[PDB]
Ligand binder design. Structure first.
Ligand SMILES: [Mg+2]
Ligand SMILES: [Zn+2]
Ligand SMILES: [Zn+2]
Ligand SMILES: [Zn+2]
Ligand SMILES: [Zn+2]
Ligand SMILES: [Zn+2]
Lengths: 505, 131
RNA sequence: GGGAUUUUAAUAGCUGGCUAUUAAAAUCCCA
């Protein structure tokens, strides 16, 4: 009505407005034509066609609500559910110069996958017959801080090529993770302006070759496809957008990121900014706050994986309880006080930081309780403590391995998603300085009902032979242990452990 | 620098039109759902004594029509996106568009929903008689 | 070069106050 906006600003250097038949709005009409009642009079003064005026794309607001059309600027709670779709996104731009002044065009796009795309300076030019999206004269931002952007002015590629490269990178990243793309931006204005160059929106669509949700659009074919069928597609379809600065952060991106993380140090480039933005989002959502009610759907083998961790944990706990004649066990991090094995009878105690049942103690571990817990074994199954005591059984995820259920996290940690999402601190070999890596073994004690193994604790192996039942059980536990080890978990034990003591029974 | 062109209130719909695959369906679904139609159109002062054709080089509105600047009642010129026409030339820009008086609530939507006649150059159903 | 908040100057409008546009000053974010 009366508030003007910087969107579609006439960035031309012309001193006068346009004629009524050529001007797009009433505001852009030159005043010589206007009258008192907000109408325009077709004056006999000739028009100044042909012309070319650069039009600004700064100011997009995707806040309209239309039925059938999805909401693409999601909240925090919806972004947490879409955590597998998170791709960091930075844009560094160039100022329009020469013919125009008053808009910025994208120059380098950076993504959290470590990829940078350099583009030719392209803007919208309004002409007396319509409009084009064509290359315009530009200039790197002045000052020392942007001196690295000077070579990029002579290295850009065409936008239709960079579009397909972006779609192919997104397809290679998000094929096995999600059907959606969520751009995690820090200042979403220029990011959305540059996202207008390679993204399309609309109603939700189905892939043309399968049943998955469509995530890319093909203009030459006018078709929609998912990440598996997006070969040759040139547009991203219905991406989500997240503005981290709107989550309550004061200052710039670098001081907010470096407050919590010291892993993502590097030179100034858009990919580094994107990585820092996604890392700050991960810290904001999974370290500062804990939801614990949001469940995520399974992807590849979560159920079988959890079954294998339970089997491996039962075996190692039973063997460690039998060897060394330990009579006491402290389980730190137990959510509900669930014992693992009870055939070797030992005393049990349970601790946690956020217990789900009053039977479990509220505790944080800082090595000061090593003298408190010196009379028994300490179990640290998926319990993250920077320094483990002398006599313990510890299982820890190696965050240096990334998979479908393990995403990069904050300060070297990793977000492990299986039903619930847990942020794990970085794997450190120095944390296990009082422990040793567990060798592979299998302990069987059930009665029997060709295979050779030198680490199979078995009464048949005591007799120098092997039976079919124990062989099948050993091979099944081999599959279980191999799945556990390949998934990323590593086992650490007290120093005095040796499987020869298991020959006692 | 530069000179502003559009109001803030329109910035919600035009941005939508800048991103959608089908801008015409996007605008019509936005307006039909109850959204505010585009404002800030170049509406001219006419003597209301014209021939009443749809698109003309000069204002030609009759008593039951209002003349608008052609580049203002085109969705693609307002959103500054590519035109669907052959060779990319707008058929409204540089000319004047006559809108029926009972449709001045949304001139852009009227121009998106209606097309002029090939033979007589009047709006189909609003002055065209070729039966 | 783009924008947000506060203040000021000019212009226009409304009923001593206010609103909008343009410009200027400060702080912050973005390039
Ligand atoms: Mg940046
Ligand atoms: Zn598909
Ligand atoms: Zn970081
Ligand atoms: Zn046997
Ligand atoms: Zn047009
Ligand atoms: Zn006709």
């Amino acid at each position: 009505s009366q508030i003007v906006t910087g969107l579609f600003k006439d960035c031309s250097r012309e001193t006068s407005g346009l004629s009524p038949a050529y001007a797009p709005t009433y505001v852009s009409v030159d005043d010589k034509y206007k009258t008192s009642d907000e109408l325009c009079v077709n004056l006999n003064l000739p028009a100044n066609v042909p012309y070319s005026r650069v039009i600004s794309r700064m100011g997009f607001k995707l806040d309209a609500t239309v039925p059938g059309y999805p909401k693409l600027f999601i909240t925090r709670e919806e972004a947490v559910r879409q955590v597998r779709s998170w791709i960091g996104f930075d844009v560094e731009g160039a100022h329009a110069s020469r013919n125009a002044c008053g808009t910025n065009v994208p120059l380098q796009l950076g993504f959290s996958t470590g990829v940078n795309f350099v583009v030719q300076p392209v803007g919208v030019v309004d002409t007396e017959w319509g409009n084009m999206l064509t290359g315009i004269a530009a200039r790197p931002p002045p000052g020392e801080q942007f001196k690295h952007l000077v070579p990029l002015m002579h290295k850009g590629a065409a936008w239709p090529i960079v579009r397909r490269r972006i779609v192919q990178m997104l397809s290679d990243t998000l094929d096995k993770l999600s059907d959606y793309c969520t751009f995690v931006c820090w200042a979403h204005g220029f990011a959305l302006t540059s996202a207008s160059y390679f993204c399309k929106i609309g109603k939700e669509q189905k892939c043309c070759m399968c049943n998955r949700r469509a995530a890319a659009y093909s203009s030459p074919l006018q078709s929609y496809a998912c990440w598996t069928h997006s070969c040759g597609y040139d547009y991203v379809y219905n991406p989500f957008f997240v503005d981290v600065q709107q989550w309550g952060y004061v200052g710039n991106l670098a001081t907010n990121h470096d407050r919590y993380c010291s892993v993502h140090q590097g030179a100034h480039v858009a990919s580094n900014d994107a990585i820092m933005t996604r890392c700050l989002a991960i810290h904001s959502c999974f370290i500062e706050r804990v939801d614990w009610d949001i469940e995520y759907p399974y992807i590849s083998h979560e159920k079988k994986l959890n079954s294998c961790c339970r089997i491996v944990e039962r075996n190692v706990v039973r063997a460690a309880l039998l060897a060394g004649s330990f009579d006491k066990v402290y389980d730190i991090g137990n959510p509900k006080g669930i014992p693992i094995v009870d055939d070797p009878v030992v005393d049990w105690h349970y601790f946690d930081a956020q217990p789900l049942t009053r039977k479990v103690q509220q505790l944080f571990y800082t090595e000061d309780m090593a003298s408190r817990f010196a009379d028994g074994l300490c179990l640290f199954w998926n319990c993250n403590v920077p320094k483990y005591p002398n006599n313990a059984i510890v299982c820890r995820f190696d965050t240096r391995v990334h998979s479908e259920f393990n995403l990069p996290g904050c300060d070297g940690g990793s977000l492990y998603v299986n039903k619930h999402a847990f942020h794990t601190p970085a794997y450190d070999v120095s944390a296990f300085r009082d422990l040793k890596p567990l060798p592979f073994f299998y302990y069987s004690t059930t009665p029997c009902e060709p295979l050779k193994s030198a680490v199979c604790i078995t009464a048949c192996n005591l007799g120098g032979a092997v039976c079919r039942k124990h062989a099948t059980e050993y091979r099944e536990y081999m599959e279980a242990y191999n799945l556990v080890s390949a998934s990323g978990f590593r086992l650490w034990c007290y120093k005095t452990f040796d499987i020869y003591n298991l020959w006692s029974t | 620098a530069g000179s502003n062109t559009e109001f803030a209130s329109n910035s919600s719909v035009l941005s939508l039109v800048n991103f959608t695959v089908d801008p015409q369906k996007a605008y019509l679904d936005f307006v039909n759902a109850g959204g505010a139609p585009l404002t800030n159109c170049v509406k001219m002062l006419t003597p209301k004594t014209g021939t009443g054709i749809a698109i003309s080089v000069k204002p030609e509105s009759t008593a039951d029509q209002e003349t608008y600047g052609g580049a203002s009642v085109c969705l693609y010129c307002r959103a500054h996106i590519e035109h669907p026409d052959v060779s990319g030339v707008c058929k409204y820009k540089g000319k004047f568009v006559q809108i029926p008086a009972q449709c001045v609530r949304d001139p852009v939507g009227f121009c998106l929903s209606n097309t002029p006649c090939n033979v007589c150059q009047y709006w189909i159903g609003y002055g065209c008689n070729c039966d």
